[PDB]
Design a protein around this ligand. Sequence first.
Ligand SMILES: O=P(O)(O)OC[C@H]1O[C@H](O[C@@H]2[C@@H](O[C@H]3[C@@H](O)[C@H](O)[C@@H](CO)O[C@H]3O)O[C@H](CO)[C@@H](O)[C@@H]2O)[C@@H](O)[C@@H](O)[C@@H]1O
Ligand SMILES: O=P(O)(O)OC[C@H]1O[C@H](O[C@@H]2[C@@H](O[C@H]3[C@@H](O)[C@H](O)[C@@H](CO)O[C@H]3O)O[C@H](CO)[C@@H](O)[C@@H]2O)[C@@H](O)[C@@H](O)[C@@H]1O
Ligand SMILES: *[C@@H]1O[C@H](CO)[C@@H](O)[C@H](O)[C@H]1NC(C)=O
Ligand SMILES: [Mn+2]
Ligand SMILES: [Mn+2]
Lengths: 151, 146
Amino acid sequence: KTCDLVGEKGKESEKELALLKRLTPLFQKSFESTVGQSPDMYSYVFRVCREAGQHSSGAGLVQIQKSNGKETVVGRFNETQIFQGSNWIMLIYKGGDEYDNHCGREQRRAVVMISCNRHTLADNFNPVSEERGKVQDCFYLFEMDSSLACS
Amino acid sequence: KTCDLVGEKGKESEKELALLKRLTPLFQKSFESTDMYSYVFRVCREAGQHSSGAGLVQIQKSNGKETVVGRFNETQIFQGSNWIMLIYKGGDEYDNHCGREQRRAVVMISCNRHTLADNFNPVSEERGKVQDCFYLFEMDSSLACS
Ligand SMILES: O=P(O)(O)OC[C@H]1O[C@H](O[C@@H]2[C@@H](O[C@H]3[C@@H](O)[C@H](O)[C@@H](CO)O[C@H]3O)O[C@H](CO)[C@@H](O)[C@@H]2O)[C@@H](O)[C@@H](O)[C@@H]1O
Ligand SMILES: O=P(O)(O)OC[C@H]1O[C@H](O[C@@H]2[C@@H](O[C@H]3[C@@H](O)[C@H](O)[C@@H](CO)O[C@H]3O)O[C@H](CO)[C@@H](O)[C@@H]2O)[C@@H](O)[C@@H](O)[C@@H]1O
Ligand SMILES: *[C@@H]1O[C@H](CO)[C@@H](O)[C@H](O)[C@H]1NC(C)=O
Ligand SMILES: [Mn+2]
Ligand SMILES: [Mn+2]
């Protein structure tokens, strides 16, 4: 099980496929981070096209509430979209858990900005913000370094 | 009259309104790509010459045809550490691509101390998907620094 792109097999973007192929070396890797104070003590676990959760729900990125260890799925890698610019790669996992009292109760979303760092294959995975104040198109933002994002 | 964010007036995300304020000094400017097409980009202002309400337009050099890539009444904007991403939705619909959906503009604005705004260039056009296609552009700006 790897990331799934938009469209039945074959109608898929050769650009996005070429990118998935490029990110292969990060598949085996796992990224973690704990942000927040208390009602914010969160631990975000991120993976590229691999289960980042312990509930086998196909999570590409999970948000763990340190207090009670409850696991929330922020995005799923079978609803993945990717594209790159000159020195960055944007990764997006959709199909996350539904909001209950925010954003029209739409599924959660994770947006990961991958910037170019010649010094490491991958490192510095850091949560930036959560936009849950819109009627739609909300999301969680994270950033990380990777030499794969370089040209 | 400027950029329109998802939601009712005065009820839009405070994170986006804040961002629109920081980009005000770019409102009165106009950016152009340096092929076959010419792209003209503007922040929350008409970039075309046909009152279509275009935020970014693609011009057919040979015949002067103006194609609306995205309109500013349908903006989405957010920022990271040293970059801001602006997206204009609702361009002219595709005829033989992307489930004939409306075109779209994605502009990546990276930080740069030396300029208020410069180096606007097309990066690519993703028209090979059943949906969620888009045109991608990059530009430098000191307003993208923090
Ligand atoms: O699905 P909704 O609209 O409720 O947003 C949920 C947020 O959940 C995580 O953060 C919690 C959350 O708590 C709500 C209930 O689930 C919780 O059981 C009771 C207390 O027992 O409080 C409710 O507010 O929202 C608050 C908002 O301030 C957070 O502080 C809590 O940690 C997390 O996934 C958020 O990102 C998400 O929007
Ligand atoms: O809406 P569709 O699916 O047709 O894609 C349109 C593309 O339009 C711009 O590029 C044109 C295009 O040409 C097709 C017709 O639109 C055009 O009117 C006739 C000639 O009068 O030729 C057709 O093939 O596609 C070609 C592909 O190589 C371009 O070279 C042309 O300039 C432009 O907006 C594209 O980005 C857009 O997908
Ligand atoms: C945006 O403006 C266009 C041009 O008038 C219009 O057709 C479209 O419905 C508008 N979209 C929104 C934000 O409702
Ligand atoms: Mn909830
Ligand atoms: Mn056409």
